[PDB]
């Protein structure tokens, strides 16, 4: 009942084993003769054992700037910050003289150090294809008053599948078991591909390309303070041999996005991904059975507790409450012509039943084009509802 309200909803019917394609945004309603109607939706995709290859700094900050100079023939200057790996140091030569603070004229050694602090970073994760955990929700068409489009899934069974553990038997309380045999149909294989995660965005890039970016980096082994290649974003300036100055090279964030145009993009969300790739599954209804079926028809009348609404697919949803006696009971349902001659509408919510009288039942069915009569219950007080379908 979870798929009701979703536009990208596929209606799949099986002869007596059926093939379904699940994707993010997609929803599949499965139907089989004498088998309960089920709603399948891919809710989560997660790379479960990612190995950080490298972490690149795209935005750098230079703080705690220290400088030391020596007069000519007084030796190379030295700061204790040189030994500190969080700092970037560079030695240079400056013109020294009498009006400068030196007894003798000549080139005097200068040293500038600055603390390299990363503001924003990029992470390159290498994902094993077999380690992509897919979370699928199997929501049966239980009529249950809250079931209709209920995201919480307290109505549907949550099942986890990986490209390799593709065969799973899922137990649906009151319906039996459904056997699912999946296979991933990803746009690009993760063989020689690095999942380049930025912040809220992700891409799939060639390994060598990723390892060749001229940016400061930390290895997967040091996820750390000692950034390798700080020089790729840090530049030292001394153009008149008067003063040495340290300068950052500015945020490479936007620059990166431009280089990542000719790359496969993915929607990211803190460890979990909204992958474009499909998931081709095969499922068997052999061990599935309708809840009740051995039940007797409802002797009493029904009460339409919510306005009949039409879904984006032309199907209609009706919420009815039982006012009679007999529960657990079986709802008599029929969609016939204006003259009550032949039955015309297809029932989506197969075998509609009443569990508790107090609890309403949501029945979904495909009404025929034009004028139809929705008949819910039996005589007397039989709900006669006229319907329009252009």
């Amino acid at each position, epitope marked *: 009942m979870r798929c009701i309200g979703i536009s990208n909803r596929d209606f799949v019917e099986g002869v007596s084993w059926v093939d379904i394609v699940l994707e993010h945004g997609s929803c599949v309603t499965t139907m089989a003769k004498n088998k309960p109607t089920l709603d399948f939706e891919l809710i989560k995709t997660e790379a479960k054992q990612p190995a950080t290859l490298r972490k690149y700094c795209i935005e750098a900050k230079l703080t705690n*700037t*220290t*400088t*030391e*100079s*020596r*007069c000519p023939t007084q030796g190379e*200057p030295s700061l204790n910050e040189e030994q500190d790996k969080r700092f970037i140091c560079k030695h240079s030569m*400056v013109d*020294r003289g009498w*009006g*400068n*603070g030196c007894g003798l004229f000549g080139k005097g050694g200068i040293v500038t150090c600055a603390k390299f602090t990363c503001k924003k970073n990029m992470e390159g994760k290498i994902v094993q294809p077999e380690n992509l955990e897919y979370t699928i929700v199997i929501t049966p068409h239980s009529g249950e008053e809250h079931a209709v489009g209920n995201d919480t899934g307290k109505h549907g069974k949550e099942i986890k599948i990986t490209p390799q553990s593709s065969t799973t038997e899922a137990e649906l309380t009151g319906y039996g078991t459904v056997t699912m045999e999946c296979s991933p149909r990803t746009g690009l294989d993760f063989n020689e591909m690095v999942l380049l995660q930025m912040e809220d965005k992700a891409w799939l890039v060639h390994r060598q390309w990723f390892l060749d970016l001229p940016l400061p980096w930390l290895p997967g082994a040091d996820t750390g303070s000692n950034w390798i290649q700080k020089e790729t974003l840090v530049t030292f300036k001394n153009p008149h041999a008067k*003063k040495q*100055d340290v300068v950052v090279l500015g945020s490479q964030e936007g620059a990166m996005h431009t280089a990542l145009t000719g790359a496969t993009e993915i929607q990211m969300s803190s460890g979990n991904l909204l992958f474009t790739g499909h998931l081709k599954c095969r499922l068997r209804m052999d061990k599935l059975q309708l809840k009740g079926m051995s039940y007797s028809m409802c002797t009493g009348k029904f009460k339409i507790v919510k306005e009949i609404a039409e879904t984006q697919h032309g199907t209609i949803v009706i919420r009815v409450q039982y006012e009679g006696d007999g529960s657990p009971c079986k709802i008599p349902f029929e969609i016939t012509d204006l003259e009550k001659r032949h039955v015309l509408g297809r029932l989506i919510t197969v075998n509609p039943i009443v569990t508790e009288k107090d609890s309403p039942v949501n029945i979904e069915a495909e009404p025929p084009f034009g004028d139809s009569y929705i008949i819910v219950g039996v005589e007397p007080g039989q709900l006669k509802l006229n319907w329009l379908r252009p």
Partner: antibody
Amino acid sequence: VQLVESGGGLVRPGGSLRLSCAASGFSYSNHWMHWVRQAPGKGLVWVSRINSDGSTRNYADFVKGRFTISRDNAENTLYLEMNSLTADDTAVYYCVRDGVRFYYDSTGYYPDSFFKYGMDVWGQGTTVTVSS
Amino acid sequence: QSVLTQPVSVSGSPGQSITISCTGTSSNADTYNLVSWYQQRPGKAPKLMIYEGTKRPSGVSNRFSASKSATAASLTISGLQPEDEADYYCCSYATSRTLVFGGGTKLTVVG
């Protein structure tokens, strides 16, 4: 030649304060400037120094990085931004000029190791009381 | 690292010559070559008396002289006067980049 400090007063423990010194009667931009403090009835304690550029800022070991020295050459002003203040920071804070370094390095830029210095001009000092 | 230590007090009579010593721990000849001396009269701001171990600035009385060795620095006040009663502080480099003051000496001109 004068140095006038401002910004001193009562501050709560863990609190912050910004001291400000106004210089006049000399080429401020070419001189190193220092902050020295003195606890009531106690000895002089060197706090910090800054070169002409602001490229070199040095601090005493007790200021683990809690104070930041700065200057505005065009405004002839020296500052001392102080955070995480404790009772051991209660003192008179003096704004001081290194007049003798100017005689050797007229730029006031070069941070040579152990250079010839002399704190020749002192302000009247501003009182900082760190109390709970 | 370098720490400067001075006597707590020195007492002299008017007209006499008194000497205040400034000794260091992790110090060397350069520490004393760079010693500066400051006079602080009660409730007044300090005043530079000596810089560069032995140099006296203009305006500072000729009665003030200083000496330095490779192990200590000393300030000598010759012809002690009542106005010389003050606290005296020595100062030099703690490290290549920082300064350090001595503990101070209270000079009493005996009355």
